[PDB]
Design a protein around this ligand. Sequence first.
Ligand code: NA
Lengths: 246, 250
Amino acid sequence: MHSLTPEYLAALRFDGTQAATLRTLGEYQGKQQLYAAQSPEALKGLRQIAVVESTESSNRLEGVVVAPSRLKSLVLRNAMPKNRSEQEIAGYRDALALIHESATHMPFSEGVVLQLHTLLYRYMPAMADLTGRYASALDQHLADPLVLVPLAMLDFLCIHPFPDGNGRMSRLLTLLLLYHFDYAVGRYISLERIFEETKEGYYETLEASSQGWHQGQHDVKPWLDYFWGALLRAYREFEERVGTIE
Amino acid sequence: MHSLTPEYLAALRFDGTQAATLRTLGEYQGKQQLYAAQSPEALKGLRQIAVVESTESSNRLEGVVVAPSRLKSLVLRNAMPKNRSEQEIAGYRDALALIHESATHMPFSEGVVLQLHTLLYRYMPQAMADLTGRYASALDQHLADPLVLVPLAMLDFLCIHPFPDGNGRMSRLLTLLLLYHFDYAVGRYISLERIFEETKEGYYETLEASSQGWHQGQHDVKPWLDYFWGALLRAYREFEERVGTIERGR
Ligand code: NA
């Protein structure tokens, strides 16, 4: 878990641009409750588009697609999957549904990760060291959660802990950890979709930042800049739908 | 203007702590708008305390004090000053009130700075050229977050020492002015001057520390930034404690 070691984290340095990006994401989080108070009538409409786009993009990034009309039925009218592709959609759908409704009760432990992985594949016929370093980084404030969350996911993808679903699991765990710090934009704007729309950047930054990872000499700036950027696109897109402030 | 030079700003680097601090202040900034509308009563109560503390504390840091009963008659009843001490309390009172009501119509221009310095010495018997245009240039190009530009502009303001007298009080008044330009309105409900006075040792140790090698443009602004942000946090944390009390024991 080279990204979450005390040595690696204590060495991280941010330029004036990154610093401003963090302050800006702090601002968006703070206004989350205002935006809602101003346009609660808009929240339902956003959720349905997000829940569908999330299941659609997260699976399509893995080459899994279903007929457009079946996507609707599986996600919105709880339909039964009839083939391998639909079974992977219903699986992500259930995992996603649980995180949106219980993330604040689900800690980042092997138990929860295995629980979510089990849902993801429920229609199909060193996590201890990751969760521990992450837990230890929070407990000691070794870095802001907007740094730990993305580095933990970088390490998760490098660790490649399950034979299948590591990419989708990384995207599901991203929502889970963001909710632990009340970064709820993921509920009204699909992060999986935002990543799929910047698909090239998503995979280039992950590969660039996972280079030299085994030696602990990897550079996380490419992945952080991309992550914070997608998180901003989500807030700006959420803002463009529920007004602004004074 | 060694702190607001593109080279000095493009060079600044922040550790994991400083980064978390900026994120935290960003969090507080964007939430006191709804935190206000949900507790209007508590505010008006804290405001009549901060306005008195701001004037009391900003002037006492300069060794200027008045009778305890006179302080309230001057600040809350616009009483007329009857000696030099009261004339400085009254001047700050007027400049402070002007900022709390027109800050968003008062850009950081030489005009606004002199307008304020003139008020500060309204009851008394009797450079900024670049600093302002340098800050303007830094904001326009986004060379740094406003939580960096503001504190560095005040460090430069104090090092320039542009007025024969008032530079200290002026820096504290200008701090509130600039913070309002970025929606950091906690200074109205929790006195930033008082928070500085309660930690005066840190206020001066960091200003003297971060101004070493200032003329050659090779000074370390971390001591001052860390102190400033820390003070701005005590203010917001203290605002959440006070609004969480006055609204539970009605
Ligand atoms: Na909890």
